[PDB]
Design a protein around this nucleic acid. Structure first.
Ligand code: MG
Lengths: 249, 229, 98
RNA sequence: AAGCUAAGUUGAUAAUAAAUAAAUAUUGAAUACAUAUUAAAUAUGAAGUUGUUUUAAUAAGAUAAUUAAUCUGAUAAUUUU
């Protein structure tokens, strides 16, 4: 029950050898990375209001992050996926809004059809949480510091004065028809072109922003909210992600 | 200032004048055709005016009543054919909407006009009485007429009524006595028949109408919802 | 020659664990905050738009600070304005003195 | 009032680590001494390098779905994040 196969002498006699460590390998890259140990959770920015520290009586602007129905769906491993991470879902969504494929996926992992799915990358296999398990605000401690990701408000097409804080020109002293313009955009013939990355008018905002080391002020399971000190990027009802911070761990 | 209402490529005062004018015209004629944008803003005004009128009619507070009246006066041009408009609002127009919570005006999309490509629309008061005595029909509510026409067409074809049509009819009914509605339908139907080529058998038509009303009035997937195991 | 008999499986769809009206949360939070701040609506009563004897521009008032919290001196001022806001707890008043 | 804004608020100025520059060394011949190596070995060493961190793009891989009474999209309507 053999098949007609041949084999070259050059390949048969070739002594076995292991390929060394490539730096652009995923594995190596993983080692390099400065990742958080624990996981995080997805949230919706609801609004902003003032927190009052009752001892010091100090007013802190605080943004409210609502943690509705956050649940780990499934996780990714170094063996299969080349990094360690947990896919977290947020919030319920009506069947009508969800693709058949996505519904199927959700079923596979015994969760409800989610509103927003996002991976949180972690260090080591320890950081992973059992799948199908629910997360509450109680996952964070008051006083601890977190890193927040969200999508900034879109400013549409913006001038150079607003994008990059260019000074524009003088308001009245001869100056004609160019008050808010960017000025020169290059040099003469000895580049003879506009260099890549020249600051120019264009779309601004609606981009990802990571804001680091924000203090968790409060965490109330009874209201499904976390309170974060300061401003978090994006509009009301934008999806936010919070992990425990890396700089102040 | 930015994003509270449409601007309509007119400076404040002029815009205000336009909108008031449109409201007045709507009150006068019951239904008007204009550009979509203008209609949309005009409806906002008109609805507000209607609500003010309602409040004036209802509220016991003399002070409130007076204030509402003043507001109404402000929001109109009472001059030419609108001279008796104040009276009309209180006596004729407002009562129709006493039970209805908002949605007094209806905007319906037409075809964009050929010359300008500007998107057009009909703006009209909702429950407008279709039958004026010493006159026959009134310049009333287009939607109702359209519905009736559709019904007639269906009857002619001997097809079942579309669910959408039925829904529309139900909506029409909600704030309407049954008998009155029937009468209105009958009035419309004869006229429609006259306009069209179709013949008119009275009793039969009445019967049909009755049948239509009855169904309207007396009310009657691949995904499996299951609990988390 | 076996024909491939397709079978589109009926996909289950599980319900959510938690039951939250996301549209209400903020209000609730605000309420909680106010409860935390002023027990028995004391500070709230003055500044209430429903209270007749409220605080008005023109009133002269003495603000007394807590000594346990801070070491600030008490301030007397004529109220120029009360700043009422969308939510309650962040209301203030602007008062002056020569 | 909303919104937009800074003169306002909040946050960051990216670690740890690896190999190094100038330089500082150990042993140690060639050359009985001396020599940090323009010899074999063994070490320290910079706001620089590599890397990290951040954004944008790309899409390997992964989960699921499969000719459809409500498969996946588009056209259409009401809209603003
Ligand atoms: Mg600062």
């Amino acid at each position: 029950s053999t098949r007609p196969f041949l084999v070259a002498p050059s390949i048969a006699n070739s002594i076995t050898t292991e390929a060394p460590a490539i730096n652009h390998s995923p594995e190596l890259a993983n080692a390099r990375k400065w990742l958080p140990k624990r996981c995080g959770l997805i949230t919706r920015k609801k609004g902003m209001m003032p927190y009052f520290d009752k001892s010091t009586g100090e007013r802190s602007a605080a943004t409210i992050l609502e943690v509705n129905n956050v649940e780990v769906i499934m996780h990714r491993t170094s063996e299969v996926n080349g990094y360690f991470a947990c896919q977290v879902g947020y919030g319920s969504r009506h069947l009508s809004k969800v693709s058949r494929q996505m519904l199927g996926h959700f079923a596979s992992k015994v969760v409800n059809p989610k509103e927003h799915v996002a991976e949180f990358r972690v260090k080591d296999e320890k950081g992973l949480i059992p799948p199908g398990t629910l997360l509450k605000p109680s996952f964070f401690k008051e006083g601890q510091y977190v890193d927040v990701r969200s999508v900034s408000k879109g400013k549409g097409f913006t001038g150079v004065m607003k994008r990059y804080g260019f000074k524009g020109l003088r308001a009245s002293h001869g100056t004609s028809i160019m008050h808010r313009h960017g000025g020169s955009y290059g040099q003469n013939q000895d580049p003879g072109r506009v260099l890549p990355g020249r600051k120019m008018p264009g779309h601004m905002g609606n981009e990802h922003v990571t804001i680091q080391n924000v203090k968790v002020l409060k965490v109330d399971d009874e209201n499904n909210v976390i309170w974060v000190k300061g401003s978090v990027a994006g509009p009301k009802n934008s999806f936010v992600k919070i992990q425990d911070a890396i700089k102040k761990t | 200032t930015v994003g509270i209402a449409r601007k309509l490529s007119r400076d404040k005062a002029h815009r205000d004048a336009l909108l008031k004018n449109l409201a007045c015209q709507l009150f006068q004629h019951e239904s008007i055709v204009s550009t979509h944008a203008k209609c949309k803003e005009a409806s906002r005004v008109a609805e507000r005016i209607i609500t003010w009128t309602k409040r004036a009619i209802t509220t016991s507070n003399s002070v409130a009543q007076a204030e509402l009246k003043s507001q109404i006066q402000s929001q109109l041009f009472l001059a030419g054919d609108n001279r008796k408009l104040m009276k009309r609002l209180f006596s004729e127009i407002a009562p129709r909407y006493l039970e209805r919570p908002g949605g007094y005006t209806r905007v319906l999309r037409l075809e964009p006009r050929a010359n300008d490509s500007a998107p057009q629309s009909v703006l009209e008061l909702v429950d407008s009485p279709v039958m004026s005595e010493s006159h026959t029909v009134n310049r009333g509510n287009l939607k109702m007429w359209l519905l009736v026409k559709s019904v007639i067409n269906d009857d002619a074809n001997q097809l079942p009524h579309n669910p959408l049509t039925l829904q529309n009819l139900h909506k029409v009914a909600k704030f309407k006595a049954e008998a009155q509605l029937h009468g209105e339908i009958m009035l419309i139907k004869q006229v429609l028949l006259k306009e069209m080529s179709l013949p008119y058998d009275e009793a039969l038509e009445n019967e049909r109408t009755q049948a239509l009303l009855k169904e309207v009035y007396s009310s009657s997937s691949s995904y499996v919802m299951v609990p988390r195991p | 020659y076996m024909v491939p008999a397709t079978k589109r499986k009926t996909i289950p769809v599980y319900p959510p664990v938690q039951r939250i009206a996301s549209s209400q949360i903020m209000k609730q939070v605000a309420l909680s905050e106010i409860e935390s701040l002023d027990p028995g609506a004391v500070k709230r009563k003055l500044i209430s738009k429903k209270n007749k004897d409220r605080l008005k521009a023109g009133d002269v008032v003495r603000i007394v600070y807590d000594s346990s919290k801070c070491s600030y001196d008490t301030f007397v001022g004529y109220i120029l304005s009360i700043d009422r806001k969308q939510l309650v707890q962040d209301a203030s008043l602007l008062l002056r003195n020569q």
